[PDB]
Amino acid sequence: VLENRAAQGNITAPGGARRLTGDQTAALRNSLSDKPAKNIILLIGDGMGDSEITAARNYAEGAGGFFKGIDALPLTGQYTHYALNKKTGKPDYVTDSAASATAWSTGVKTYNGALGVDIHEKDHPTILEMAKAAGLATGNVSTAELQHATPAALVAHVTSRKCYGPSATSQKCPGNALEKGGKGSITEQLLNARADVTLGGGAKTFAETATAGEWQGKTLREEAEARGYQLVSDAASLNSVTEANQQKPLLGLFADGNMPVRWLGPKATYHGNIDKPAVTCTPNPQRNDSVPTLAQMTDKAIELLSKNEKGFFLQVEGASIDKQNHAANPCGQIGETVDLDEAVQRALEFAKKEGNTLVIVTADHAHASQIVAPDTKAPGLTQALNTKDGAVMVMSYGNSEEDSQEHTGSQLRIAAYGPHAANVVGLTDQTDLFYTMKAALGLK
């Protein structure tokens, strides 16, 4: 159960590549606790399967290096995340972000595109909803529009993840449409859910006006304000916040859509590893210093949520690992994994210091990227990258002739730390995670 998993020394020498310093048996036996967790932090790297973890490590930390956050969770396993076909109720082997997010927040499988509803379009409570109910503080942070599938699955029950605001819901989720007797669009259900801390992007959807109810006529922003929400739009005002609770819930909207990626790099191209020079990522100049980082949001949320006595449940999402994977952009993809590692370090530090916190880091599904030989002549999109090792690493995206590269169905890594972390070991299902959290918190 070491906290240092980096190669021991000279990787070309006997035992120099080893990551293990001694015997884990005692150490591991000592990290196995079935006492209840008081808090739970679930970090989700969108689309971050093992391939994505390995490439970012190879790049940012080197083959023999290790993520001080992502790689430091002692209890590990692999979990399945297949979705269901709506008609047949038969497995659909490659899930989308909505059906998967619904799985751990609800504990029930569903079809691709569904948020908070099973294949019968029946609503099921999310873990955030049950937490809030038991008196725990709740947080939801992401680098994507808050209406996006991952953060949304915790506060909304909609038939199509496309129903962001009143106007998309009216036409695509008419039974959820507010003016039709429904609970409302994702943004509206988010505002109703009223989690203590909610941070991310997606401010543009808040400019839509409600079509029915009490705040009908007022934009969703005005409604948030009318309801007691503190609204912050940058790093400065975020840090300024001193409390967030059911009286003064916090709401951060740091971008119209998704928050900017941290690194810039060209898009992978056909024969790019052969015809184009190896690339070295650089910071993204479009991204402002006023826009908080995932670690910053994670840290602030923990500070505000840790004030609650029953405890808290927080979910953090490094959203754009997925987005840049779809875009066949290695740099944007690696930057987002590094960004997430930071958020995991913040969490682990709190967890270790507090001692009753279960921390879980995993991904909702696998994605396109593969690490291939430098000389690979692949049919898809490729790019050579200069790693920290001073060597070249080639990444391939070859599962779509369309612009967007697709998700994949491979089981992926799930790692945990803290009370009830043993339930993540071995083969499990994405729906088991729901039960693991529900029981760790004794949230029954």
Residues 332-351 that bind its own copies (CB under 8 A): none
Give 412's strand partners: 79
Answer for the pair 246, 196: CB distance below 8 angstroms, yes or no: yes
The answer to whether 150 contacts Mg ion (rule: CB under 5 A) is yes
Here's the x/- map for its own copies, 44-83, by CB under 8 A: it reads as -----xxx-xxx--x---xxx-x----x-xxxxxx-x-x-
**Chain position carrying tokens 């196995």:** 32
Nearer to Mg ion, 83 or 178 (CB): 83
97 is catalytic: yes
Which amino acid appears at position 221 of this protein?
R
Minimum CB separation of residue 326 from Zn ion in Å reads 5
Residue 206 has what DSSP assignment?
G
Selection from Zn ion, Mg ion, its own copies, none that 116 binds (CB < 5 to 8 A by kind) is none
Helix, coil or strand: residue 338: helix
The answer to whether 170 contacts Mg ion (rule: CB under 5 A) is no
Helix/strand/coil (H, E, C) string of 252-263?
EECCCCCCCCCE
Q: Which of 51, 97, 100, 170 is an active site residue?
A: 97
**Part in contact with its own copies (CB under 8 A); list of ranges 40-48, 242-250, 252-260, 384-392:** 384-392
Here's the x/- map for Zn ion, 329-368, by CB under 5 A: it reads as -----------------------------------x----
Query: How many other CB atoms are there within 10 angstroms of residue 30's CB atom?
Result: 11
Here's the x/- map for its own copies, 407-436, by CB under 8 A: it reads as xxxxxxx-x----x-xx-xxxxxxxx--xx
**Chain position carrying tokens 């799985």:** 103
DSSP secondary structure letters along 23-75 = -HHHHHHTT---SPPSEEEEEEETT--HHHHHHHIIIII-TT---TTTT--SE
Residues 6+ apart with CB under 8 A from 181: 175
**Part in contact with Zn ion (CB under 5 A); list of ranges 93-101, 173-181, 206-214, 255-263:** 93-101
- Give the β-pairing of 392-397 and 381-386: antiparallel
Minimum CB separation of residue 343 from Zn ion in Å reads 17
Residues 304-323 that bind Mg ion (CB under 5 A): 319
The answer to whether 147 contacts Mg ion (rule: CB under 5 A) is no
Q: Closest residue (Cβ) to Zn ion?
A: 97
Nearer to Mg ion, 30 or 404 (CB): 404
With CB under 8 A as the contact rule, the residue among 34, 256, 309, 403 that binds its own copies is 34
Structure tokens at 321: 């690992």
Minimum CB separation of residue 379 from its own copies in Å reads 4
**Part in contact with Zn ion (CB under 5 A); list of ranges 67-75, 90-98, 246-254, 389-397:** 90-98
Residue 174 has what DSSP assignment?
T
| Residue count, binding to Mg ion (CB under 5 A) | 4
Comparing C-alpha atoms, which of 125, 134, 144, 112 is closest to residue 45? 144
Structure tokens at 259: 């928050």
Helices (H), 281-395: 294-305, 320-326, 330-354
With CB under 5 A as the contact rule, the residue among 196, 322, 341, 432 that binds Zn ion is 322
Structure tokens at 40: 């739970």
In angstroms, rounded to a whole number, what is the distance separating the alpha carbons of residues 321 and 338?
10
Residues 58-117 that bind Mg ion (CB under 5 A): 97
Selection from its own copies, Zn ion, Mg ion, none that 319 binds (CB < 5 to 8 A by kind) is Mg ion
Residues classed as catalytic:
97
* Residue ranges in contact with Zn ion by CB under 5 A: 46, 97, 322, 364
* Residue ranges in contact with Mg ion by CB under 5 A: 46, 97, 150, 319
